[PDB]
Amino acid sequence: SLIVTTILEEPYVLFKKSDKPLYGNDRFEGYCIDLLRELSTILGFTYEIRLVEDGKYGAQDDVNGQWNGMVRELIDHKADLAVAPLAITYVREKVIDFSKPFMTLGISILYRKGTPIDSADDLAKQTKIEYGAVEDGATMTFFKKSKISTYDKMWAFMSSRRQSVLVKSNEEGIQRVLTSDYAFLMESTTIEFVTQRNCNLTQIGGLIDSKGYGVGTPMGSPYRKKITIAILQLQEEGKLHMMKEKWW
């Protein structure tokens, strides 16, 4: 019986609503929950869902070199699978395995409508409008690791004000955008979700890069291939598209 680590994130994973107390895996619904279920069927496994305890996706501390969050749990064999909006990044592929992507997205900008801002560059070359990303995120990491002119400057900007422009959750990042002169760097899929519930927000510019989400397995895990096949199957039969329709 497989230990599946994950994390709360609308509409990927979230506590279901009801009137009478819920226990175990019934506590959860969401796109990733649906997906977990489909894989569960196709590959014939039983599974226990656990929320990652530190509440983080996965980042590496420069100095000591330790990993945290879901990625850490995978490394330690404390979980068998990580099923979340976990980005397939190359720093991560060096420590865990990933199924082929069940979703392709990209970094982009969340800002309110009708500003002159039209791209990442327009943000970089000024200072009035602040900007940031989820701290220890894949998105933040992209900027930290980037030797592209524009993004290096934008990183320089953020790392110098992390106290105030780097947020701890996609929610908090959206709140900043809505309550100050702030533009948020988040994933396109999540932007696409938010720009429905909030009608004064929009995606500025296009996709900055092009990552995917994948199922996290400890390195060398047999399920990496199994789950890749299952996912390829789910794409090809329209179920993944249907599932996104459903939650967006």
Ligand X SMILES: C=C(C)[C@H]1CN[C@H](C(=O)O)[C@H]1CC(=O)O
- Residues touching a copy of itself, count (CB under 8 A): 29
The least CB distance from residue 166 to a copy of itself, in Å, is: 20
Q: Which residues belong to the annotated binding site for L-glutamate? A: 85, 87, 92, 138-139, 187
Give CB contacts under 8 A, 24+ apart, made by 194-200: 194/110, 195/110, 196/248, 198/174, 200/112, 200/113
Alpha-carbon distances, residue 109 vs 133, 182, 188, 196, 200 (angstroms): 10, 10, 8, 15, 14
Whichever of 152 and 212 has its CB closer to ligand X, that residue is 212
Q: Return the residue of 56, 72, 176, 211 that touches a copy of itself, per CB under 8 A.
A: 211
| Residue 101 DSSP class | P
From CA 217, how far away is CA 148, in angstroms rounded?
31
* Binding of residue 11 to ligand X (CB under 6 A): no
Contact partner, 100, from ligand X, a copy of itself, none, Cβ < 5-8 Å per class: a copy of itself
From CA 108, how far away is CA 84, in angstroms rounded?
19
Binding mask of the shown chain, residues 97 to 136, with x at each position contacting ligand X by CB under 6 A: ------------------------------------xx--
Q: Which residues bind ligand X (CB under 6 A)?
A: 9, 57, 85-87, 133-134, 137-140, 170, 186-187
